[PDB]
Amino acid sequence: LTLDEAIKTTNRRVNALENVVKPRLENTITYIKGELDELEREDFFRLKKIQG
Amino acid sequence: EGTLEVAMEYRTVTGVAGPLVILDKVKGPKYYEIVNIRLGDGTMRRGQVLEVDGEKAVVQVFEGTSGIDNKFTTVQFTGEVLKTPVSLDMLGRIFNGSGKPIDNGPPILPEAYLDISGSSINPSERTYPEEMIQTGISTIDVMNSIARGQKIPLFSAAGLPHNEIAAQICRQAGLVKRGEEDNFAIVFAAMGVNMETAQFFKRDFEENGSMERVTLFLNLANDPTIERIITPRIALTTAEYLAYECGKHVLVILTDMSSYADALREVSAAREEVPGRRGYPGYMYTDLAQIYERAGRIEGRKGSITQIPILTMPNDDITHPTPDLTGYITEGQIYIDRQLQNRQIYPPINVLPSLSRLMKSAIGEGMTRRDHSDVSNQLYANYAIGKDVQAMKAVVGEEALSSEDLLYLEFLDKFERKFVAQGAYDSRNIFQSLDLAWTLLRIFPRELLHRIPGKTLDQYYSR
Amino acid sequence: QAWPVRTPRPVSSKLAADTPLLTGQRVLDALFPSVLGGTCAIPGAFGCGKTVISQALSKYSNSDTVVYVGCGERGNEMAEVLMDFPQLTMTLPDGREESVMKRTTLVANTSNMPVAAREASIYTGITIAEYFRDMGYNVSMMADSTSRWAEALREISGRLAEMPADSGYPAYLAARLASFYERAGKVKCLGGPERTGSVTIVGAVSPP
Amino acid sequence: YGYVRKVSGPVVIADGMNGAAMYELVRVGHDNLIGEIIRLEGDSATIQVYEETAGLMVNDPVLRTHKPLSVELGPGILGNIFDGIQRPLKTIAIRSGDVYIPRGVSVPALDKDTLWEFQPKKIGEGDLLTGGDLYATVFENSLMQHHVALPPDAMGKVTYVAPAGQYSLKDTVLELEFQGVKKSFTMLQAWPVRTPRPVSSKLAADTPLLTGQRVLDALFPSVLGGTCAIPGAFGCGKTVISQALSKYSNSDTVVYVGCGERGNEMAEVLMDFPQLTMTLPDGREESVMKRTTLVANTSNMPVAAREASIYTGITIAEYFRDMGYNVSMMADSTSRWAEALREISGRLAEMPADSGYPAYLAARLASFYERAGKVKCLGGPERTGSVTIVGAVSPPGGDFSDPVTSATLSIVQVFWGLDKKLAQRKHFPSVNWLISYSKYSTALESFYEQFDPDFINIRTKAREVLQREDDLNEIVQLVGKDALAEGDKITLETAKLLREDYLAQNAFTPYDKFCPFYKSVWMMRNIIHFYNLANQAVITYTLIKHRLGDLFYRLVSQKFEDPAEGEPALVAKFKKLHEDLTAGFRALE
């Protein structure tokens, strides 16, 4: 019984929890770098264009 | 007729930066006028005038700005937008990215010069696709079928056999036959393909003997990145001439649409335009529309343009901007799974994300069977339940599959084993495959089936 | 008549809407109802083909008139609409048999059509519905892919080199979209008799 | 003629250059600082100077070169050491005496005063010749004969042929006239790095790259003129494979290209190559440097030179292939090259793309990699060479998701996949069989069957055994070896024997330093045939295991045999061992 419970918990952690978190980390990385960093350069580039 | 004029040759080139060549003192420029630039060395390359302001002109050269001298290069303004000399004789030949004949053959004698990026069809005159297609592969035809005029791409990550699938479809392409002059003529765009893939395409097409009805627009990765953007335009313009202006149905194929997306990204980053998601241009939706949104059937003409693009998820992610916008525009998806490839299945078509938004009209009584829709819906829906059962078995154990869940698991196993798999040259007919599809649906009890009514399949009979 | 396309049609006094929109769908009219005069919005991410709900609502709504003004949508949907609305039919309380195409107009421009015309599409649609409302009817619309009229905004803001606000969209995007959506609602019209027509904005926003 | 006007860090603006051309290299200042032209706005130019621009003076002269970034080819290209911008490090060190690289060195790429033995072909003084014709060959050194190809984009009837003798590059070895005008050609050819070398036809690769390692030769073969990828960051596997390629590979030449790596690492590798020596099949002993060229650009080198080193190396490889030699390039760190490109893009303020790399990174990597392949030569006499790239990759933390890694995996046909886990487990080959693949096996099958029609079937069976190895792995993991059947136990034992006896090499040991394809094929046959013959007998696994001890020892020793006995003796021994194993498996059944 104890081994069954522990194996269920371990399998759930391996399959559900970690594979739930890692996409969340990837989406958070993409949202910050893929958008905010790109916008910051674009904003500054447009400002430099205005100055020129 | 209005008297002709020789194009003015300028030498006032007064600035080069990136891929953009600046000019000054231009006398009466024209937007998107094609200009061929002759360098001081004498070599010539083409280019378009992107922005026209005052008497200036910001030209985007094609073969690259390298070798352009601000006091020895000459630019000639033809005064006309880019035009592809389409002709009926163009069939059975191979052309470069811009259209240079590369089959050691004489150039095209144009029946009519036609401008690329032709105007849209008045949607009042637009009609609806109403006929199925016999490509020669079972799983695409049986479920998420393709209509004669329907656009639908292939989603397949890098390294997958999607090129082989495209070649097999093109070689085995044909009408349902339920005629040869109007039979499928295939325009085969090739944006950013490898040299080995190019030789493979040429040899495979020459081997099937259907060179008489197939046109190759090859554009290697060695060719300039901007020249890849005009390859789909030229291919679709030639397809438009063949279909609407000559009659024969055209099955347009474009490989590596992700390469076209990369070309768009490079060109946009060159001019420093407003970036959408993942740094792609903010107008990529409109460009992918102007590429894709030409498949269809026009009312007054008997032609039909069927579109079968081939995308490639970069990180094997459906959320990437290119496949996402495509799925927004492309009216359906035929999906290819790497996981099924790991199981050594030659046509790794995963049917769970694959749906044809026009299948509801391709099916009917004129073709197929009256139980097509319900059987397709069941083999589409029970796969998800089988996947859920597999996940539950993985996270709990083999004992979790009850008298009902184990049935779903067996359904999934047999569905992945027999139904999806097919021969590398097997032309599996619909009814012979639909019998096995019915058997797969009948693995589950004939009363637990919720969505399908029993009578629909009961009209059909086994053996 | 004639009317500026950006200036809203004048009215007597807007008033609260208290009549449900009988869409004929279980989910739309049972759990998450909509009122005849309210504003809706369907995200419908890629691959969902949200326009099926749009077409069903236009076919089977209790609204007297429908203005399907799909902007940036695929032409095949417009072909489907033009092909099926006449051959499809509905019945009225008088007992006669008639088509739904007798009351549906399309101001739609496809995605391959020029970009700048999309804002004009949206505004012409809303003004035509406003006119049909001032007639007194319970007119409604549904603008397919209003998010395309944000690509239309930014593809112009880029040429003007306006300062990007968020993801490239200009700053006034929310302001303009509110100015569009805020034209719905039941209202006593101008002049007698006491018409009390409404208008419904069932928008569709496609997210990346 | 030409003076600077604005010097803002690397960027330099020079007036009075109306005739300048885009991407034309230029000499800046008295110190002869070298930089490339970027924008030609107005009558002025714009130059980014590679070396540090500190100390430039306004109105200091700027001297044009009328040539893009180019490399001077010809005799003496082999053996030496060159920087990213084609600067001979050895001769610079000798001339300047000191160790530091002078800021503004002007030493020519190859010594134009040294003498080389020259002899023309049988061509006549009034014959006709065209671009790519091989009119002479030169003994640059022993056993590395150098053909002298008439440069492309040059043709005409022969006017003068230099008779055989001692000559230098400054001598006018050839003169000819196409039209009434006549041109005289020396032994030095200049070619821009960006422009590829002219080709007649891109052939289909039809000969494997015998690296001398069994795992690469048989499990995941690579073909001449084919791309290759290595995830090399630790374990010295990149050094091991580079040494194997230099010493035993079929290539007649090797061109190592190192960009932007650790300086001491390049010191170690550039001191390792001279120590490396290879014996000739004729029994002669040579030095690998006599056929090796090295282009090393450390991190201290200017970023533009770091980006240009790869193109310099690939152009050198193409020039070598122009005379039909089989040459292999080795990009030390493509990740460093991509980082250098990123730094250059950031300098140019180009719009950032995915993960910060410029949007053309994938396109430029594909353009570079597309130059590899077996190609028919240009001009007569008829011959064919090849250029194969074995450029490695350094993914961050091993995550094959960075754009460099993704593009490389999308372009490269064959990926060998060194694994740090095997290195931790003391694996000399360190090649992970679970991730490596060879997409060129379908094209190579012609030669594979011509050599041995059963070899391809053996390879397929070995792939199936490897696939079942992990299956048996989790089988033992979950229930143990007890639940394995006799056939399953035999399959597991054979997979373990293959992994620990043939799929792994011993490198350092003299007997397993080089693995001939003959020995590899016989070992694979003696393993797979024995595996089957034991398999169909299911017989108790314990009984056959007890009675196959001699057969197991023979199978293990089938790789312990040194190549001294040669192919005829080792093949006979392996055949006898296989026959004995078959007899023992069949008679005892």
Side-chain angles (χ1 to χ4, degrees), chain A residues 6 16 21 23 28 34 36 39 42-43 47 51-52, chain B residues 1-8 10-23 26 28-29 31-32 34-40 42-50 52 54 57-59 61-62 64-68 72-79 81-88 91-95 97-99 101-102 105-110 112-114 116-121 123-124 126-129 133 135-143 145-163 165-169 171 173-176 179 184-190 192-193 197-198 200-201 205 209-211 213-226 228-244 246-255 257-261 263-265 267-270 274-276 278-292 294-298 300-314 318-323 325-336 338 340-341 345-351 353-358 360-364 366-368 372-373 375-376 378-381 384-386 389 391 393-397 400 402 406-409 411-412 415 419-421 423-427 429-431 433-440 443 445 448-449 452-454 456-457 460-462, chain C residues 2-25 27-30 32-45 47-72 74-79 81-93 95-129 131-143 145-147 149-150 152-154 156-161 163-181 183-187 189-208, chain D residues 1-5 7-14 16-17 19-21 23 25-30 32-35 37-38 42 44-47 49-50 53-56 58-59 61-66 68-71 73-79 81-82 84 86-89 91-94 96-97 99-102 104-110 112 114-120 123-124 126-127 129-132 134-139 141-143 146-152 154 156-169 172-174 176 178 180-181 184-201 203-205 207-212 215 218 220-237 239-242 244-260 263-264 266-267 269-271 273-274 276-277 279-281 283-296 298-299 301-306 308-317 319-321 323-328 331 333-335 337-338 340-342 344-346 348-349 352-353 355-369 371-375 377-381 383-398 401 403-412 414-418 422-423 427-438 441-444 446-447 451 453 455-456 458 460 462 465 470 474-476 478-481 483 485 487-488 490-492 494-495 497-498 502-504 507-512 514-517 520-522 527-540 542-544 546-547 549 563-564 566 568-569 572 582-584 587:
Chain A
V21 172
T28 297
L36 272 298
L39 291 203
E42 173 67 47
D43 280 357
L47 191 47
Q51 307 202 40
Chain B
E1 185 167 302
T3 316
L4 58 86
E5 171 171 47
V6 186
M8 312 275 148
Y10 291 79
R11 201 158 44 80
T12 72
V13 166
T14 312
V16 182
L20 291 63
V21 159
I22 317 297
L23 280 74
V26 190
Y31 189 79
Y32 266 43
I34 283 289
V35 288
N36 46 325
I37 297 95
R38 160 180 201 91
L39 313 195
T43 183
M44 293 177 71
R45 48 185 66 151
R46 298 167 69 77
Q48 277 197 353
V49 62
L50 269 194
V52 183
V58 179
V59 175
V61 303
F62 275 5
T65 45
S66 69
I68 296 179
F72 277 88
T73 195
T74 72
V75 179
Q76 183 174 332
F77 279 66
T78 76
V81 300
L82 177 55
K83 281 170 178 170
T84 302
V86 302
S87 177
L88 174 56
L91 272 157
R93 305 183 63 171
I94 318 184
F95 309 116
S98 67
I102 46 180
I108 308 296
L109 169 59
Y113 292 117
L114 182 52
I116 71 167
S117 191
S119 82
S120 183
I121 299 92
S124 56
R126 188 76 83 81
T127 58
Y128 212 68
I133 308 183
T135 67
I137 291 173
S138 51
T139 177
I140 179 172
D141 298 6
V142 177
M143 201 145 77
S145 55
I146 174 63
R148 191 202 300 126
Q150 167 167 22
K151 56 187 86 80
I152 193 163
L154 312 184
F155 281 44
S156 180
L160 297 187
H162 53 247
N163 291 114
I165 294 166
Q168 204 279 329
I169 285 178
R171 293 164 324 100
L175 290 156
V176 293
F184 280 116
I186 309 183
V187 163
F188 196 83
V193 300
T197 64
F200 162 73
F201 278 135
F205 264 122
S210 291
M211 271 305 178
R213 61 176 184 113
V214 166
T215 292
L216 299 173
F217 292 106
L218 301 184
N219 164 270
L220 313 183
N222 264 270
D223 315 317
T225 176
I226 179 65
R228 196 184 307 154
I229 290 187
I230 76 180
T231 284
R233 317 283 176 141
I234 290 170
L236 292 159
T237 306
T238 307
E240 283 199 47
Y241 177 78
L242 291 181
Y244 302 164
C246 198
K248 45 185 54 60
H249 318 284
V250 183
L251 176 66
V252 189
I253 317 289
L254 307 97
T255 60
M257 272 303 293
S258 55
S259 88
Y260 182 79
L264 273 172
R265 180 164 55 170
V267 168
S268 58
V274 165
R278 210 74 54 82
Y280 287 114
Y283 59 90
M284 183 177 176
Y285 180 89
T286 297
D287 200 79
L288 283 188
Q290 294 175 359
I291 299 299
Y292 292 156
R294 296 183 185 178
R297 304 182 66 255
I298 177 60
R301 301 172 151 90
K302 65 178 72 66
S304 182
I305 305 183
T306 298
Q307 183 62 256
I308 314 293
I310 296 92
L311 280 80
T312 296
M313 283 73 74
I318 195 170
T319 189
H320 182 280
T322 302
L325 296 180
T326 299
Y328 272 121
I329 308 159
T330 190
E331 298 178 357
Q333 314 86 310
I334 300 301
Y335 182 76
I336 289 164
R338 173 163 315 280
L340 302 181
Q341 172 68 10
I345 295 158
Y346 155 72
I349 294 90
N350 171 11
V351 304
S354 80
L355 59 89
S356 163
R357 292 213 274 252
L358 281 160
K360 61 191 183 270
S361 81
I363 62 170
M367 258 287 279
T368 73
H372 184 306
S373 60
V375 163
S376 58
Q378 295 298 289
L379 276 74
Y380 192 95
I385 316 301
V389 167
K393 182 169 181 182
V395 304
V396 186
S402 72
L406 183 60
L407 296 183
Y408 299 144
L409 184 61
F411 160 89
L412 175 56
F415 183 81
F419 179 86
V420 174
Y425 300 89
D426 178 23
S427 312
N429 207 15
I430 175 172
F431 304 142
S433 50
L434 201 62
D435 292 314
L436 277 300
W438 192 93
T439 316
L440 264 291
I443 282 175
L448 184 56
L449 298 173
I452 185 171
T456 53
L457 59 82
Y460 196 28
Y461 39 86
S462 55
Chain C
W3 193 248
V5 189
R6 295 207 164 82
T7 300
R9 290 275 287 192
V11 307
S12 177
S13 176
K14 293 173 71 175
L15 58 89
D18 50 346
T19 48
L21 178 81
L22 291 184
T23 70
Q25 291 287 306
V27 55
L28 304 188
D29 297 346
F32 296 100
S34 181
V35 66
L36 268 161
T39 64
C40 182
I42 294 156
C48 192
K50 48 189 165 297
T51 65
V52 58
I53 283 167
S54 161
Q55 276 141 28
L57 191 141
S58 52
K59 288 168 181 180
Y60 295 103
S61 161
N62 52 8
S63 50
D64 296 325
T65 305
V66 176
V67 181
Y68 176 82
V69 67
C71 67
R74 294 160 280 98
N76 277 2
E77 293 179 353
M78 314 297 167
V81 171
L82 180 59
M83 182 179 72
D84 73 344
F85 277 180
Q87 74 89 1
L88 190 149
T89 186
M90 72 87 88
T91 185
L92 73 164
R96 300 181 284 102
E97 189 276 331
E98 286 282 0
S99 301
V100 310
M101 182 36 88
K102 304 294 188 75
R103 67 184 183 100
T104 299
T105 184
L106 316 183
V107 187
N109 72 279
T110 58
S111 60
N112 57 4
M113 271 184 191
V115 179
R118 190 167 297 112
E119 183 178 1
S121 309
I122 288 294
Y123 280 144
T124 46
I126 179 56
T127 43
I128 290 172
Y131 172 48
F132 284 135
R133 167 177 51 78
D134 281 347
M135 293 177 70
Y137 292 165
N138 296 344
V139 66
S140 66
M141 65 183 73
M142 72 291 291
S145 61
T146 71
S147 176
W149 171 55
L153 267 297
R154 80 172 164 215
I156 301 169
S157 182
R159 322 308 275 209
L160 261 61
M163 187 66 204
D166 201 13
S167 181
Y169 303 109
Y172 45 71
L173 174 71
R176 205 172 304 289
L177 187 151
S179 296
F180 165 67
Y181 267 101
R183 209 182 302 183
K186 261 181 68 91
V187 56
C189 302
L190 270 169
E194 311 325 299
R195 297 142 293 145
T196 314
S198 79
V199 54
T200 305
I201 305 299
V202 194
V205 288
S206 307
Chain D
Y1 38 90
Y3 55 96
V4 305
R5 217 196 64 217
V7 189
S8 54
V11 184
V12 169
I13 320 298
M17 293 177 71
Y23 291 88
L25 270 292
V26 75
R27 296 278 172 72
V28 178
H30 297 297
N32 295 322
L33 275 193
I34 292 168
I37 279 181
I38 302 313
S44 167
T46 285
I47 314 153
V49 194
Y50 307 163
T53 46
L56 262 179
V58 167
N59 310 101
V62 177
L63 177 76
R64 301 178 58 186
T65 75
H66 305 299
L69 178 43
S70 64
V71 172
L73 279 299
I77 186 71
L78 277 161
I81 192 66
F82 301 131
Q86 184 53 75
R87 267 180 290 95
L89 285 166
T91 61
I92 283 165
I94 294 307
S96 72
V99 167
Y100 309 107
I101 289 297
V105 65
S106 302
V107 181
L110 322 168
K112 296 182 177 66
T114 309
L115 294 174
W116 281 270
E117 178 75 340
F118 177 85
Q119 67 95 26
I123 68 169
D127 299 4
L129 285 183
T130 187
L134 289 177
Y135 78 101
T137 181
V138 175
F139 293 99
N141 59 4
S142 60
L143 314 181
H146 181 300
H147 298 292
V148 186
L150 197 148
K157 64 182 181 293
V158 182
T159 289
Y160 164 74
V161 176
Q166 188 70 257
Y167 299 89
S168 88
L169 272 70
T172 78
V173 292
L174 205 64
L176 60 86
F178 167 70
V181 63
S184 187
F185 310 147
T186 69
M187 293 177 70
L188 190 144
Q189 309 177 27
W191 192 264
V193 295
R194 257 56 178 265
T195 308
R197 211 162 177 78
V199 303
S200 293
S201 54
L203 266 295
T207 296
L209 175 58
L210 188 141
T211 63
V215 59
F220 316 100
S222 75
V223 192
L224 287 180
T227 61
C228 295
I230 301 295
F234 183 76
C236 295
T239 61
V240 168
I241 191 66
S242 62
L245 259 65
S246 45
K247 298 154 65 43
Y248 316 110
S249 80
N250 315 337
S251 66
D252 291 331
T253 309
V254 65
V255 179
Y256 204 101
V257 181
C259 51
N264 47 6
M266 294 296 172
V269 75
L270 293 180
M271 295 298 102
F273 289 106
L276 299 190
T277 187
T279 185
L280 269 299
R284 274 301 321 121
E285 182 65 26
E286 212 186 350
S287 86
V288 67
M289 208 67 39
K290 289 171 69 66
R291 79 162 168 236
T292 299
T293 304
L294 304 164
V295 180
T298 71
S299 50
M301 313 283 324
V303 63
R306 298 201 311 259
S309 61
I310 298 303
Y311 293 114
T312 292
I314 200 62
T315 303
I316 290 187
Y319 169 63
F320 279 136
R321 184 213 54 215
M323 71 225 78
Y325 285 177
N326 294 309
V327 60
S328 310
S333 180
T334 57
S335 58
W337 178 83
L341 197 79
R342 189 211 299 190
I344 296 158
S345 175
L348 269 296
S355 78
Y357 298 106
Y360 42 71
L361 166 70
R364 277 196 157 104
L365 273 170
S367 81
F368 156 65
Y369 271 89
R371 298 174 75 157
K374 184 161 182 173
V375 181
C377 76
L378 190 76
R383 77 278 187 193
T384 287
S386 62
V387 169
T388 183
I389 311 170
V390 70
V393 60
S394 310
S401 68
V404 194
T405 75
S406 308
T408 299
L409 288 169
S410 84
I411 305 151
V412 172
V414 177
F415 172 79
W416 279 341
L418 306 186
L422 296 175
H427 280 70
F428 298 124
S430 308
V431 172
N432 180 7
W433 40 98
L434 294 174
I435 63 176
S436 182
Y437 64 92
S438 167
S441 59
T442 176
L444 203 60
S446 63
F447 159 78
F451 178 85
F455 165 65
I456 171 164
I458 284 158
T460 58
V465 166
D470 58 78
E474 322 97 340
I475 282 159
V476 176
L478 65 95
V479 59
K481 53 183 283 283
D488 291 331
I490 284 162
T491 311
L492 177 142
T494 47
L497 178 138
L498 173 58
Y502 175 55
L503 192 50
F508 302 93
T509 66
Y511 74 84
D512 210 20
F514 169 80
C515 180
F517 200 62
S520 299
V521 164
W522 292 97
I527 293 167
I528 297 301
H529 176 107
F530 180 78
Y531 160 64
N532 320 127
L533 266 293
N535 223 26
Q536 78 263 13
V538 180
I539 186 59
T540 305
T542 293
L543 179 59
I544 175 62
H546 277 68
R547 75 207 194 177
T582 307

